[PDB]
Design a binder for this molecule. Sequence first.
Ligand SMILES: Nc1ncnc2c1ncn2[C@@H]1O[C@H](CSCC[C@H](N)C(=O)O)[C@@H](O)[C@H]1O
Ligand SMILES: NCCc1ccc(O)c(O)c1
Ligand SMILES: [Cl-]
Ligand SMILES: [Mg+2]
Ligand SMILES: [Mg+2]
Lengths: 218, 222
Amino acid sequence: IHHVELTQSVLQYIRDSSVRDNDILRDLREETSKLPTMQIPPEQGQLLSLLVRLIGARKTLEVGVFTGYSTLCTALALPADGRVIACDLSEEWVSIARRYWQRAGVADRIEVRLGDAHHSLEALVGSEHRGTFDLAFIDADKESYDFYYEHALRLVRPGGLIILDNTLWSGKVADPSVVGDPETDSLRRINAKLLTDERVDLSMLPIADGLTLARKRK
Amino acid sequence: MIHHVELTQSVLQYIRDSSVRDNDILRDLREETSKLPLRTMQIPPEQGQLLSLLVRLIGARKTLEVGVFTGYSTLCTALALPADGRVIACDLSEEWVSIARRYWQRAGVADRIEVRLGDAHHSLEALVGSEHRGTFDLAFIDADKESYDFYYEHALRLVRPGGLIILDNTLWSGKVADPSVVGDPETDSLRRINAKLLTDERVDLSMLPIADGLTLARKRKL
Ligand SMILES: Nc1ncnc2c1ncn2[C@@H]1O[C@H](CSCC[C@H](N)C(=O)O)[C@@H](O)[C@H]1O
Ligand SMILES: NCCc1ccc(O)c(O)c1
Ligand SMILES: [Cl-]
Ligand SMILES: [Mg+2]
Ligand SMILES: [Mg+2]
């Protein structure tokens, strides 16, 4: 399998010749880097902005959130009446997320469901929000990816896009020595399941920690 | 340091095995292209599949292609289009496009593909001056690398606002990043278009580290 050698020189080049950065995004990345598999690279955040604008999304779902880099890139790409429903795992990094979203003037476009993502997603599938999302970004605990995926399939509209982060898990999914690891096994299972899942169109991208695109078929 | 997943043959084989939905038609075309002097110009199956996804994602009906070869990219595009969809495909070689037409017929999509045979410069000038101006949903640029700016500027007028422009080989085997590669026309042209895209406020941009570098440029609405 022929490929481009991802030397620091080539990765620095991709960054320098494609990343449109600003002080707000840069400052958030810097702050996040000083804290305890949730560091979104700027190339990924920019792709997220592109895909949102590409499908004419006004309503999106997020599972994970953390300091809110992926959420900020999403919201910035949305129209003035757009909304991100962000299912935030914990309140620990909420006050950081809130600061940058306010600073970038997107806080009015972001709604936080604070607490257990299984519970917010269960409420959402039984709510008026069912089948109304244009895009879903799954970036939470890896053991719950199947649950998040099945819930996202009911939450997104036909033709909607589901995005699954970390599907390569540092290459561990491909590593035969990594045996019995719950996160690796769950990601291996969802990856295998997606290949033969006729409900979606599929693309697994070798960007950041592996980024899977699953378009819900009409 | 920029952290990344090591692209070992094991990891690349995994991406292929766990995501590529293949068929005999696509497989046979890749096999027939591999037995030609310029086989390395073919897009890998993961790129073809992404092309199908993006076409379906934006609800595209009408697409532009510059650089057809044996037509793998064209076939993936046409297959993703609705029954009344159209690909306007530009290519210099009749020989390579005579191979392409066999697979397009076999996959029942030959009716969806229109070939402008000859120099793409003249084909795109004719298209910009015609009824086709601003009617394309997607443009795939994958021809001679020295003409990428010309192809890009023409694609910007040919695609509708919100339309997607896709530029292949923007990493050129890493040569664009290689300081020892000096005075090479293809490398210099790709370096120039890459630098130009970064500050081009007419588009939303994403440079993907897939295949030989794949640049996505969404024409903004205004
Ligand atoms: N000036 C020009 N006008 C039209 N086609 C050109 C051109 N210069 C090069 N080409 C074409 O660009 C192609 C490059 S390879 C294209 C690869 C193809 N899309 C795939 O999926 O395999 C060749 O077929 C070559 O004929
Ligand atoms: N691989 C170097 C040769 C090459 C030339 C033109 C292409 O479009 C292409 O994908 C590859
Ligand atoms: Cl816009
Ligand atoms: Mg993540
Ligand atoms: Mg190419």
